[PDB]
């Protein structure tokens with residue numbers, strides 16, 4: 253079973269992955285996790301991150317260039333994902349293809365039924381062959397609270413300063429809205445919308 | 461020995477590679493060739509090409525995004541290049557790293573000592589580990605004649621319509637000028653500047 257955890261920056265995805273993995277293991281299932289972007293393991297992922305921190309000329313100014321880099325990062329992980337799915341009972345991803353649809357549409361002020369989301373579908377699932385997730389869990393949180401978490405992280409960790417997307421409050425708001433639409437539309441597969449107070453044990457039961 | 465053939469679009473590079481390969485083989489040396497972008501064998505190369513033909517939103521509008529895609533294409537060929545160099549006496553490339561420096565600098569109206577060329581050096585040779593060529597042969601041709609060849613190709617081949625770069629006469633002119641500077645500076649290694657009437661036999665002897 254392939255599960256992807258989605259949501260805006262600072263929504264609490266990393267923590268939910270930890271809790272969810274614990275719940276599944278407590279139920280006797282083997283779990284493997286992977287986070288995108290694969291910082292350090294992908295040139296594409298690293299250049300993308302660096303561009304969001306002000307490097308690489310005009311790269312970050314292109315919405316499709318950024319989307320392509322994140323897609324190329326995942327392209328390099330296709331075999332790894334397939335291998336994990338046949339080796340473990342559950343594979344949980346901290347961000348996946350939907351992140352590209354949500355952020356790209358939001359940067360272009362488009363909705364889930366727009367051009368960018370359709371492009372992501374065509375490129376990542378059909379062309380690159382990335383498997384569609386069995387479940388996509390949207391950790392919905394107020395744009396205000398998520399932004400507060402991102403700012404707090406930068407304050408206590410010099411290695412986690414905010415990037416261009418995180419500094420854009422309006423973009424984060426629009427991204428959250430597109431995510432809600434993607435979930436309602438069942439984009440890329442079935443979705444579940446949860447809040448910060450979701451119970452890991454029952455969520456795992458729902459996904460199982 | 462690693463040799464890269466450089467020059468603007470329609471300069472006659474593909475033909476020179478054929479003639480040069482023949483000369484080396486006539487001298488008893490084993491030869492292997494590779495052309496960049498690796499159309500069909502690289503997602504990065506294909507998306508780059510498609511962007512130059514009007515697809516993928518705002519991707520082509522970013523100079524660094526295009527450069528990154530061509531660099532990622534080469535990154536996926538590092539092992540292939542190293543393998544060919546230890547398996548054959550001579551390895552000839554139809555375009556290599558210098559193409560990225562020349563075209564990127566030209567799109568930004570910069571010279572060979574500018575920011576873009578320096579970025580290509582840092583990213584491709586140092587960071588990606590691409591081997592520096594023993595020789596880089598600049599097939600210098602009048603911008604007018606090269607443009608005529610590109611237009612003629614599109615006229616007789618529906619599968620070879622010109623792309624955004626080829627349709628930009630001024631860009632082609634500036635690229636030729638940056639190439640001349642790169643050669644004079646010995647950027648990335650030693651260069652040889654030749655014309656359309658260069659003798660394949662003697663050129664091969666010079667490179668040998």
Ligand SMILES: Cc1cn([C@H]2C[C@H](O)[C@@H](COP(=O)(O)O)O2)c(=O)[nH]c1=O
Pocket residue numbers: 261288289319322323347348349351352353355356417418
């Ligand atoms: C994985 C992924 C992330 N992003 C984003 C959202 C984040 O603001 C930024 C880096 O992700 P991160 O916050 O998970 O480290 O890039 C995309 O736009 N597309 C993608 O496919």
Ligand SMILES: Cc1cn([C@H]2C[C@H](O)[C@@H](COP(=O)(O)O)O2)c(=O)[nH]c1=O
Pocket residue numbers: 469496497527530531555556557559560561563564625626
């Ligand atoms: C290989 C390569 C090509 N290019 C260009 C020059 C050509 O106009 C275009 C496609 O190359 P081609 O003419 O050899 O098919 O992309 C770069 O800008 N950087 C590179 O690294």
Ligand SMILES: [Mg+2]
Pocket residue numbers: 261262418
């Ligand atoms: Mg982030």
Ligand SMILES: [Mg+2]
Pocket residue numbers: 469470626
């Ligand atoms: Mg061309």
